[PDB]
Amino acid sequence: PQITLWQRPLVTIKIGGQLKEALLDTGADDTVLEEMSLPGRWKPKMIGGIGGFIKVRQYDQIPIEICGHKAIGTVLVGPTPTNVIGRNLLTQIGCTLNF
Amino acid sequence: PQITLWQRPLVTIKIGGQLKEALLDTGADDTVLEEMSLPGRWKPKMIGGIGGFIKVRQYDQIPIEICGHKAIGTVLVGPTPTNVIGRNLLTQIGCTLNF
Numbered sequence: 001p002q003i004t005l006w007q008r009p010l011v012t013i014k015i016g017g018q019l020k021e022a023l024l025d026t027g028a029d030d031t032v033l034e035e036m037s038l039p040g041r042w043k044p045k046m047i048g049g050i051g052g053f054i055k056v057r058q059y060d061q062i063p064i065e066i067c068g069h070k071a072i073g074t075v076l077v078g079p080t081p082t083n084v085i086g087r088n089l090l091t092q093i094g095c096t097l098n099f
Numbered sequence: 100p101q102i103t104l105w106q107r108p109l110v111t112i113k114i115g116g117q118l119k120e121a122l123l124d125t126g127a128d129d130t131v132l133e134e135m136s137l138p139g140r141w142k143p144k145m146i147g148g149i150g151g152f153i154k155v156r157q158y159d160q161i162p163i164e165i166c167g168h169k170a171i172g173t174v175l176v177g178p179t180p181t182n183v184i185g186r187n188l189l190t191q192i193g194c195t196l197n198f
């Protein structure tokens with residue numbers, strides 16, 4: 001699609017058998033979701049943004065579907081104020097900024 | 100231009116006659132810059148990011164060039180980890196997301 005930026009670019013994602021809303025963020029290195037369960041190994045990470053850092057669990061090789069498009073990558077889970085889809089997954093669905 | 104996301108979408112901006120680097124961030128409502136001097140009066144704003152809240156100085160109607168594209172709008176100045184260009188100015192330069 002072509003997604004306007006008059007409003008927040010929120011889309012539906014499918015992950016771990018759940019449907020969720022998340023924000024497409026070209027400025028984010030990583031994808032970070034509010035608390036949820038995911039299968040497999042994880043390790044702890046600290047990630048920084050405006051306001052400082054939060055501790056999250058890093059899960060690798062997680063399948064996800066974003067706006068209909070399948071990808072696989074690293075998903076971080078923790079006390080983020082909002083679900084964010086970062087560049088690690090945006091690249092996989094062919095997302096570009098255009099102007 | 101068309102900017103892919105395999106690296107951070109860092110571009111050159113010009114503000115107050117000076118060049119700076121800033122990140123194009125579709126996840127950001129607002130544009131937040133690192134400490135700098137701007138003209139006129141400012142108003143308070145509290146903005147929230149992944150790590151919590153910060154206090155910034157809001158300046159309105161500031162001219163800013165982004166990748167050579169002229170904009171004039173609201174710039175927040177405060178203790179941000181990086182210069183971020185948010186949707187308030189991305190809409191002025193005709194940016195969309197495409198995949």
Ligand SMILES: COC(=O)N[C@H](C(=O)NN(CCC[C@@]1(O)Cc2ccc(cc2)C/C=C\CNC(=O)[C@H](C(C)C)NC1=O)Cc1ccc(Br)cc1)C(C)(C)C
Nearest residue numbers: 027028029047048049050081126127128129147148149180
């Ligand atoms: C409506 O309120 C907002 O618009 N607030 C914006 C904001 O914070 N938007 N949030 C998206 C992520 C922003 C950002 O891309 C910004 C950023 C980019 C690069 C770097 C730091 C910060 C560089 C350093 C480290 C890399 N670090 C990230 O790459 C991190 C990732 C690990 C999530 N990236 C980010 O944190 C969503 C959000 C929304 C509501 C609330 Br309450 C909290 C979060 C703000 C404060 C920038 C205007």
Ligand SMILES: [Cl-]
Nearest residue numbers: 072073074088
């Ligand atoms: Cl990844």
Ligand SMILES: [Cl-]
Nearest residue numbers: 091094103104
């Ligand atoms: Cl590509």
Ligand SMILES: [Cl-]
Nearest residue numbers: 172173187188
């Ligand atoms: Cl503005």
